[PDB]
Amino acid sequence: RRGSFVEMVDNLRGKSGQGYYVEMTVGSPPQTLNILVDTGSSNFAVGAAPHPFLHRYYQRQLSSTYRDLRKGVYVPYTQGAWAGELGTDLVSIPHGPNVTVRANIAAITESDKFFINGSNWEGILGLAYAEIARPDDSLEPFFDSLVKQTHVPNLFSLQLCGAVGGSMIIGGIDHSLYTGSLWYTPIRREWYYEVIIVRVEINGQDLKMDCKEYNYDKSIVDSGTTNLRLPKKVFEAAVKSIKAASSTEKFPDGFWLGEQLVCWQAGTTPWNIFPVISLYLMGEVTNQSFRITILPQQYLRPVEDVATSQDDCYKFAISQSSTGTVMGAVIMEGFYVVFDRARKRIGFAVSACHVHDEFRTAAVEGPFVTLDMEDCGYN
Numbered sequence: 001r002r003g004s005f006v007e008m009v010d011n012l013r014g015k016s017g018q019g020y021y022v023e024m025t026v027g028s029p030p031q032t033l034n035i036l037v038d039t040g041s042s043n044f045a046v047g048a049a050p051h052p053f054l055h056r057y058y059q060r061q062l063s064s065t066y067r068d069l070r071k072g073v074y075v076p077y078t079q080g081a082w083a084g085e086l087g088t089d090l091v092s093i094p095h096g097p098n099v100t101v102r103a104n105i106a107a108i109t110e111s112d113k114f115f116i117n118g119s120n121w122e123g124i125l126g127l128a129y130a131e132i133a134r135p136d137d138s139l140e141p142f143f144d145s146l147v148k149q150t151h152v153p154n155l156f157s158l159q160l161c162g163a164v165g166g167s168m169i170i171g172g173i174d175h176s177l178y179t180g181s182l183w184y185t186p187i188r189r190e191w192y193y194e195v196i197i198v199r200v201e202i203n204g205q206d207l208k209m210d211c212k213e214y215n216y217d218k219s220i221v222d223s224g225t226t227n228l229r230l231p232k233k234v235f236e237a238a239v240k241s242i243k244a245a246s247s248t249e250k251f252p253d254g255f256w257l258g259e260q261l262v263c264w265q266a267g268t269t270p271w272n273i274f275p276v277i278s279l280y281l282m283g284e285v286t287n288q289s290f291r292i293t294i295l296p297q298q299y300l301r302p303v304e305d306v307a308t309s310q311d312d313c314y315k316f317a318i319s320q321s322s323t324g325t326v327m328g329a330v331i332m333e334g335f336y337v338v339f340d341r342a343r344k345r346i347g348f349a350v351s352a353c354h355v356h357d358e359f360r361t362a363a364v365e366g367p368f369v370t371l372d373m374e375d376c377g378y379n
């Protein structure tokens with residue numbers, strides 16, 4: 001009910017589905033930039049040279065506290081890549097914790113399909129662990145520096161509100177950002193925020209696949225990835241079930257592949273014809289699990305309107321992956337997600353801002369009895 005972390009509420013913004021960003025100030029004197037919050041990587045990097053899609057960038061020569069590490073860095077993502085130069089400088093988050101730390105910072109001088117036109121962000125904050133940092137795990141990630149240099153608790157939480165804003169509470173949890181209880185799943189290993197999915201249902205119907213398939217390779221929580229990405233075999237079965245569940249209206253095959261869009265007269269989108277999707281996650285007690293359920297409002301994403309027209313176009317945001325399951329924004333937008341690094345667990349609760357209608361709502365329910373969950377993980 002109360003809120004000691006009130007100043008961190010609503011500290012995230014977004015340019016209509018182009019990424020959620022927080023303001024970060026680097027150097028001396030102060031240089032504030034919009035930084036994308038990414039739990040799917042571990043490097044803190046900022047544009048440091050002009051670029052057509054950047055309104056501003058980091059000017060190292062103007063920062064008296066900047067220290068060049070004399071080493072380059074290259075970071076390739078599922079989408080895009082950039083090259084830069086490593087260094088360290090003072091960093092603070094205006095609408096985040098009341099501290100200032102010296103952190104590693106990669107100055108991006110060149111990039112390919114990384115920055116997004118009109119997104120309004122100029123850098124990225126990799127919140128994952130050192131194991132996946134580039135060039136190697138010796139480059140301490142921003143959050144590791146924050147925790148080592150200050151007394152800020154080793155935990156952060158994200159409330160991503162879709163359609164653009166949200167909140168990144170650093171060092172704690174804010175109760176006004178969620179309703180109901182928080183359910184926790186173990187962080188299986190500290191590299192990506194890896195978790196274990198034990199069951200999948202479409203409108204209450206079990207997909208009936210060996211749970212090993214759901215985590216083949218791995219399953220992670222990634223705020224830097226837009227879609228809910230599933231391994232090939234899982235994607236195919238999911239689409240077949242979703243199509244069967246939404247048979248009231250037929251769509252072209254390309255729609256389910258994200259190649260085609262479907263638009264409806266403003267305010268006439270028949271959400272009711274689309275099914276809800278439930279992912280069951282391993283719990284904190286033996287043989288116990290819980291489930292998170294999303295609505296079509298989460299997996300059917302709006303596409304930048306033509307020009308304030310009377311047509312709402314949507315893209316099916318569930319796609320395939322060859323590197324495991326990626327629970328991106330499609331999943332996160334329906335919940336308040338707690339990255340409890342201190343206790344190696346991730347909590348989920350219904351978000352106070354998730355988009356829904358008068359008939360159905362996103363949900364987090366439990367507990368359920370699921371046996372042999374340990375075997376679901378890939379070795």
Ligand SMILES: C[C@@H](NC(=O)c1cc(C(=O)N[C@@H](Cc2ccccc2)[C@H](O)CNC2CC2)cc(N(C)S(C)(=O)=O)c1)c1ccccc1
Pocket residue numbers: 017018019020036038039040041077078079080113114115124192220222223224225226227228229319326328329
């Ligand atoms: C920013 C934007 N992301 C995107 O548009 C977007 C970004 C990525 C992507 O590679 N994200 C990067 C960081 C990263 C961040 C910004 C730019 C480049 C790379 C992230 O570290 C990857 N984590 C890897 C472990 C999976 C991947 C995809 N997909 C493949 S998809 C189409 O299936 O969703 C889309 C977005 C939009 C709305 C909500 C959240 C994110």
